[PDB]
């Protein structure tokens, strides 16, 4: 199903680099459970309006399903299905004891009041209560949903479950007053930083200090990456961009300042003491590290040939296309694939659940240290195969993921071969 | 959703004969909950194969959802959704304390072995367990499912629930050894029979004795109806048919002998002493009562005109089209609309559930007599509105049904208007 | 406790007339379980407002506790405890398999909107969920609450319990679209009629036909009673009254017609087909039967002496004081005590519960017939002790009640003597 | 409520120093849930005796409620409500993922036998089962209850819950044979020591080594503190006292040796290696640190003026009155308020719960180390506000606490402002 069609495809590819039965394959192509519900919401005007919602649990062989809830007017089931499958792979690559899940509500949130948003949130839990549990299915935030929304959902869950289960553990991305974890805001960037650090290593880099990075996108990820790489790495952020434009400066930019600028003007554009550039231009800079952190399909057939970075850190999802991959590989450019690169969020989300279920909370330092250990390992799991089978890192990432899900399905007896 | 699509119509149509808000209409148009699952079955060859199943709960305002499970290679979600909405109207018309539901497995049952069928039935329960209960959603047999399939499904349900709930009550259509109800096989015919009986009364008939009825279709229902009308009501069964054609005999036929002949021969066709006719002719005889109990859309624009019967007892589902409805209504023919006419089966399924949850089983006499009361009442409920609003019986049947559901929704506060 | 104190008093009295241990007495003087909660309600102005609620479970020796929920600005816990203990005696006098319970919310419902009422009702359930169930504690309507309120409470219960238990059975007094019982409105009046019928029999009356009755109060109870006593028994309803006043007519009033008058004008007062009297006068009429069906303490030391009726049917709660009881008793007036006389309501609530849990609904005639049997039985159980001990009926009623609770406690081992 | 009134008072105070809505305030002034039950106990003489019990759950915004059970002849519900609200502030000041709760039984334990105590303890659990759980409300020992009592309560819980939830986690203060935590006995003293250590740091002291301390009270708390401050910090314990009197020695007492004296004689009074003083005098000694670890209200308007210590570590609950607080504060005396100072006990109870739910037990050193971290943190969280606002530490402690509860409520949507 277009988007859903795409996954099965990715699935088909990996298969060419590994051994897996057709039995296993057919099973993986279909999500194990899908629930689709009608949520009636009492609008502020005193009438009720109904919304359509879904929760998709793709696979739970390796453990409870994990994955966000999107609130969006063009949401469809296919998309939610495609995204749940992706979570299956991401959780496996990071070696977490989780499967993949995803949910969504077909709604335009900008039209709802907070009261109405709260009602919608609670209504979603009331509708799906039966298929979720701290040991079954753990949602999280995504497009258009946030900690506030997670909090309302948790509260409704606590009300129905009657405090007979560790309710804080039903969902992640929570505010800290009620079980949230430290490290959540910087999670992705922080996680990507460790992979960049290992890439440099394998690459033979002396250090990162002084190296250069260009970052496309100036959101949380963008901003945080910029900040970490700079203050923690010693790198030089010579360029950043936003939907408006990029900006250049070889002496390197200051994350925070660029940040305020953006605040005041609405674009990174014009920042003082720097040259304005296009996004296109940004991608082609001659840098040690290119970190595309905004939207997909920025690296294609077209410009692939002009990329000049040594390392492409995919922070955003789907930045590099498939043909571009081939070119890049052939060029000797090392890519840190999306689902591996930006996995720091799901990982910290996993640490949140551990803290909620054990009732013991961690420090930002413990969070970072454990995240470092997880990302490093994952990095190598992939690198190693890639090298071992002489294949593209992304292909190698699917192989590691699929093989772990497959082995769990075999040990359980879900498939016989 | 073609089919589903169909249903919306019916809703919109009845809406014109009664007052109901958009709030409620909109709600009624969407099913409350849908579950789609992948059921892996270990085949006899030792490999696993996956199948797609669904369970739809359209509306439960009036009580737990009720409806069969179809096993069929051309099954779609659209259809299952469409059949679930229908069960909502049907339970409401009968005034049962239930809502509507329906399930389906996309499968070609002719290719599975018995062991494989057993595994599939158990797998369906293992997959939808969380959304079923004796007070939540009660399946039953349908296309290609039967008592056997029901029994394996109950057993598995009992195994998962640990006998902590009245398990026999999870599903109906069961074998008598484990809680089935007497009267199950004759139910549809028996029910229809009471409706024909009240219809004669409203039409002024004196008695049914010696009146004539032609029955199109000679399966369970056609056969039992033949048998009942004649033996119990003293009517003359002048013609019956099967897919290979009809037989005519103005002196009245013997249901049993016809049955015997069919078994032995394959068709009612060539029954001794009778005259062979086409189905098409059967529909046009001049009888007091015509009961289409085979397939749909047998009476249309084309022949509605030729219909000579005073009463049309819609035993099969959808034998009469909308254009045909108009005409026959014009002609002053009295129609007993499918979902009212053949509701004896759901009705007895309700009685089976009652016996299971109370643990007290009834005699066939008790069964038959409570069925009469129910059928008789549902009949006049529909008939009175019909007259009183001077509308078609079918229209009145939707009116009675939608009004009940709507009222329950309002009482609960699911719609505010 | 004042109100609560009065209960001990009552309990200490029956003890004179029966042998019961101190162990028991003391257990009986205290409710087994009290839950007091704070219910936050989101008001229409979007601010949150907190209300105080309670549910008192006095004694459940004989079965699940049963009792209404009152919404009133001056509710107090003492009152609710006192009324829970009363339900204990009432269910026992009727021989129902229940104990007594009661709830209340301190609120002035007159200032809330519907939306706000709905939210307070769902909130109470969300607050006391853990201590209620169809086999544990079943509420019902009372001061300021009604079927609509019950409906919202059932709905919330259903949503929290996930349809895994027979939810319609959680609370009684529901609307008929969702599990309500036929017979609910006339229940009280209807139950009292059977008691009046037996009291006349034991009095040696010939028939009721032609006898006379005066009814104080013209609500549901007063009106239905008037209606029933006349139309069903052939009594002459010579006077009825309301808070504005009474009306009289020796030939008999026509209940419906007086109802309509009251409806337009607001009082039965000035009805054209009668002469006006006062409430005080009404109590002193010379009728065969006097039925105070309005408020308490209308027959005291002051006028007790003027009572001329042969039978005083206590429809209302506490219309005769203890001092008056003595007087009437010496005068040979037969009193049908409140908790016995007006028990048809709880009894029909018991029937609603049965229909809900068994899933099988009764006709008005079934309701009536079973009601009759229950009431008649309870009447003689009481009457026999009074006679045999030569005691006031009220005293005999407590004796019958307490002993039954006492014995169930001994059998359970709750008390050892 | 007097006791309860005093809470509102306290809450109304912190409000001066912080911005908080009325909506919140009002919610906070009432406990969310109260359960009062009657517990029947089979006495040794074989008669049944009924006792009154309660469990109050003040607020669970931040997590499961936490708090002890008191057995005392003069318990009242007002007191238990008041103490539940206090636990709410205490768990919050410590940043624990809990809310506050408390229970009590009106009994004089001194008249019961062990068999009888056992039965009352199991009875309370059988009575409040529905409202407790390892993730819902976790009790602990208090006035007149202890580990043995806790053990019997856990056992009964385990029997009712069927071992389906982590039962050891239902209650804390357990014996070590069944899930108790190391560090429990010294907890209070130990926690206070870390606070004393930081208060000296913020005071600019050099070391504690050689400083002096006077301890009022020579129970567990007094003794362990004395023991710890001397042996672990090198302070000189110059005076200790008990209800019979105090003893003094400028060179420092030896805690153990004084303990033994007390043990044989019954009072620290007359210890040979010191001179006798009074409690009043003890409070007025000129020491670096004064620790009232006995009873309340020993520092009032009367002598507040005579206090010579630089640090007053409130070990006991409420030893200094509000009027005295003002005086000491102007004098520049640093007070470590009770609920902060003596929180090591609840904190170690929090650790016991963690070990029980995770099934992994810690060493005394792990206990100590985590305790330290918790206490230190809480100290500065408090200290910083006081400093910054120039407010009494006690006021700063309520500010820190209330705000945390308040924020968790806003996030849940419990209050909207």
């Amino acid at each position: 199903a277009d988007p859903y069609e795409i996954v099965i495809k990715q699935l088909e590819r990996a298969a060419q680099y590994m051994e897996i039965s057709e039995e296993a394959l057919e099973f993986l192509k279909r999500p194990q459970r899908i629930v689709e519900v009608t949520i009636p919401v009492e609008m502020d005007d005193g009438s009720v309006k109904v919304f359509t919602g879904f929760r998709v649990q793709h696979n739970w062989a390796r453990g409870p399903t994990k994955g966000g809830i999107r609130w969006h007017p063009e949401e469809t089931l296919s998309t939610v299905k495609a995204l749940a499958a992706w979570m299956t792979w991401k959780t496996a690559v990071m070696d977490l004891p989780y499967g993949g899940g995803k949910g969504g509500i077909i709604v335009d949130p900008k039209k709802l009041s907070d009261r109405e948003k709260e009602r919608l949130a609670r209504g979603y839990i009331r509708a799906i209560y039966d298929v979720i549990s701290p040991y079954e299915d753990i949602p999280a935030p995504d497009v258009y949903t946030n900690p506030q929304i997670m909090a309302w959902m948790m509260d409704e869950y606590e009300t129905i479950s009657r405090r007979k289960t560790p309710a804080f553990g039903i969902i992640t991305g929570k505010p800290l007053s009620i079980g949230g974890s430290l490290g959540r805001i910087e999670a992705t960037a922080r996680g990507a930083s460790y992979t960049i650090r290992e890439a440099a290593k394998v690459l033979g880099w002396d250090t990162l200090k002084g190296k250069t990075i260009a970052i496309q996108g100036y959101g949380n990820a963008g901003y945080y990456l910029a900040k970490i790489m700079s203050e923690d790495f010693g790198m030089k952020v010579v360029a950043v961009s936003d939907s408006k434009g990029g900006i250049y400066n070889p002496d390197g930019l200051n994350a925070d300042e660029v940040l305020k600028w953006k605040n005041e003007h609405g674009s990174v554009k014009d920042f003082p003491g720097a040259t304005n550039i296009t996004n296109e231009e940004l991608l082609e800079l001659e840098v040690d590290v290119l970190a595309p952190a905004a939207i997909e399909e920025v690296i294609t057939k077209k410009n692939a040939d002009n990329i000049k970075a040594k390392i492409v850190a995919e922070v955003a999802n789907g930045p590099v296309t498939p043909e571009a991959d081939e070119i890049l590989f052939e060029k000797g450019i090392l890519q840190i694939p999306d689902f591996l690169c930006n996995a720091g969020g799901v990982t910290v989300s996993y640490f949140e659940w551990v803290q909620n279920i054990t009732g013991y909370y961690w420090t930002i330092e413990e969070v970072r240290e454990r995240l470092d250990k997880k990302m490093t390992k994952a990095f190598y799991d992939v690198y190693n195969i890639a090298k071992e089978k002489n294949i593209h890192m992304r292909d190698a990432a699917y192989v590691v993921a699929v093989q772990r899900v497959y082995q769990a399905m075999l040990d359980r007896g879900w498939v016989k071969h």
Side-chain angles (χ1 to χ4, degrees), chain A residues 46-361:
Chain A
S47 64
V48 162
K49 172 146 179 198
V50 313
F51 301 85
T52 284
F54 332 94
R55 188 76 180 166
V56 170
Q57 291 172 10
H58 170 256
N59 194 289
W60 58 79
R62 302 223 340 126
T65 57
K66 192 70 196 73
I69 303 155
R70 295 156 40 89
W71 278 17
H72 190 273
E74 322 272 36
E75 204 47 278
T76 64
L77 181 59
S78 289
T79 301
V80 180
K81 291 211 249 190
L83 300 174
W86 249 74
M87 298 290 316
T88 298
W89 326 127
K90 184 167 215 195
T91 48
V93 88
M94 294 297 314
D95 201 19
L96 302 176
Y98 279 166
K102 192 85 179 192
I105 308 188
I106 298 165
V107 61
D108 184 7
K110 304 153 53 255
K111 304 232 231 60
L112 304 178
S113 80
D114 278 348
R115 284 317 36 110
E116 288 172 339
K117 270 168 202 168
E118 179 183 1
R119 293 176 197 127
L120 173 63
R122 297 180 178 274
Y124 182 73
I125 292 303
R126 289 161 73 91
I128 59 157
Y129 182 82
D130 326 278
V131 301
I132 58 174
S133 106
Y135 301 111
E136 182 169 21
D137 182 29
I138 317 131
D142 211 299
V143 155
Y144 296 133
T145 52
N146 53 42
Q148 179 55 98
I149 289 172
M150 296 308 93
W152 287 328
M153 280 185 180
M154 186 278 296
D155 182 75
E156 193 71 10
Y157 177 87
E158 182 183 68
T159 300
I160 294 167
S161 76
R162 317 309 301 174
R163 306 150 67 204
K164 301 317 207 254
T165 198
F168 280 181
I170 185 65
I171 199 169
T172 64
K174 289 179 309 298
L176 249 38
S177 62
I178 47 173
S181 169
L182 295 176
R184 178 183 66 78
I185 274 134
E186 76 169 27
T188 298
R190 171 71 61 180
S193 85
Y194 299 132
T195 60
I196 278 155
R197 175 193 77 198
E198 307 288 326
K201 245 131 115 198
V202 305
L203 238 24
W205 307 359
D206 31 293
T207 190
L208 286 158
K209 197 226 124 164
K211 319 238 186 321
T212 71
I213 165 154
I215 299 171
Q216 182 196 46
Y218 216 67
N220 229 219
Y223 161 69
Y224 270 98
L225 187 58
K227 166 158 187 120
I228 284 151
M229 285 340 280
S230 74
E231 342 184 317
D232 308 305
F233 290 102
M235 288 196 66
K236 231 110 135 283
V237 184
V238 314
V240 331
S241 101
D242 72 35
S243 116
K244 263 44 193 238
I247 59 144
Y248 188 62
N249 172 354
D251 299 285
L253 327 182
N254 169 85
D256 292 291
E257 235 137 78
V258 171
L259 174 64
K260 303 177 76 181
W261 177 270
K262 173 157 210 314
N263 290 154
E264 241 278 317
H265 316 100
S267 181
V268 286
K269 184 137 139 184
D270 297 306
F271 177 85
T275 321
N276 281 32
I277 39 190
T278 84
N279 281 90
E280 262 188 34
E281 303 220 286
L282 180 136
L283 295 179
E284 336 194 347
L285 309 159
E286 201 170 321
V287 274
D288 311 349
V289 186
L290 210 215
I295 59 194
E296 72 267 78
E297 308 194 333
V298 311
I299 304 174
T300 77
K301 191 173 27 237
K302 332 221 112 174
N303 51 333
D305 197 42
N306 319 127
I307 280 76
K308 278 171 239 66
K310 286 143 210 163
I311 300 166
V312 187
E314 319 181 354
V315 175
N317 288 299
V320 187
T321 70
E323 28 281 354
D325 278 336
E326 303 210 298
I327 287 140
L328 318 178
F329 186 56
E330 199 190 69
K331 320 181 40 119
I333 285 141
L334 183 62
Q335 280 160 260
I336 310 179
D338 57 14
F339 77 94
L340 160 65
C341 196
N342 64 33
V346 72
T347 309
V348 167
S349 86
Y350 157 72
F351 292 165
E352 188 183 334
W353 177 74
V354 172
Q355 302 165 74
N356 292 331
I357 71 172
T358 61
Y360 195 71
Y361 291 78

